[PDB]
Amino acid sequence: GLSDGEWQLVLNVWGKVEADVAGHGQEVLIRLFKGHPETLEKFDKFKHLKSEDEMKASEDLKKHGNTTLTALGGILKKKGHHEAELTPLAQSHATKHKIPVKYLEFISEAIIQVLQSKHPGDFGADAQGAMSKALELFRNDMAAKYKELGFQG
Numbered sequence: 001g002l003s004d005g006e007w008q009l010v011l012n013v014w015g016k017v018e019a020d021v022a023g024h025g026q027e028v029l030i031r032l033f034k035g036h037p038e039t040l041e042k043f044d045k046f047k048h049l050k051s052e053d054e055m056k057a058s059e060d061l062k063k064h065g066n067t068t069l070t071a072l073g074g075i076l077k078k079k080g081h082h083e084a085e086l087t088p089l090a091q092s093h094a095t096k097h098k099i100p101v102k103y104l105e106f107i108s109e110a111i112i113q114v115l116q117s118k119h120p121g122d123f124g125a126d127a128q129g130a131m132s133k134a135l136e137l138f139r140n141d142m143a144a145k146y147k148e149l150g151f152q153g
């Protein structure tokens with residue numbers, strides 16, 4: 001939904017995540033939890049984490065980080081042609097995890113926040129703009145799948 005050039009700017013930045021997905025994933029979930037603490041209530045496994053130092057020690061918080069970024073990268077690499085990868089995610093999140101689209105908006109910002117803190121030199125004005133666009137496309141799609149499931153919010 002981006003130009004071919006935008007998808008390249010996206011994949012070029014993702015490449016940096018791939019050199020260390022668990023650590024980018026850990027920081028992303030920590031960024032999200034400090035930023036929208038309500039977001040932690042959706043995680044049974046994580047409600048007990050009471051500070052960042054606790055978040056940081058959590059080995060599972062970290063595996064979950066890896067899981068989330070791993071599915072997202074599978075999705076970003078389909079440069080748009082992702083329905084098969086999106087569906088099972090819209091299903092589980094829609095119906096079993098109960099995640100409103102607004103939250104997607106929050107993870108989207110933590111992801112950008114982390115690329116921005118981790119890779120400044122490399123996440124310039126062009127790249128920021130293409131990632132945002134790619135992250136918006138993913139949400140808009142997820143939104144639409146929700147709707148089709150007859151869910152919404």
Ligand code: HEM
Nearest residue numbers: 039042043045067068071072089092093097099103104107
């Ligand atoms: C970048 C967007 C996200 C991606 C790619 C992603 C990916 C995943 C994947 C691959 C799983 C395990 C498989 C599945 O259950 O479908 C999962 C589980 C889950 N996700 Fe997400 N997720 C995202 C955002 C969210 C957000 C924003 C929340 C909550 C605020 C969330 C809450 C959960 C929960 C509660 C689980 C179950 C955790 C467990 O294994 O106990 N997801 N997610």
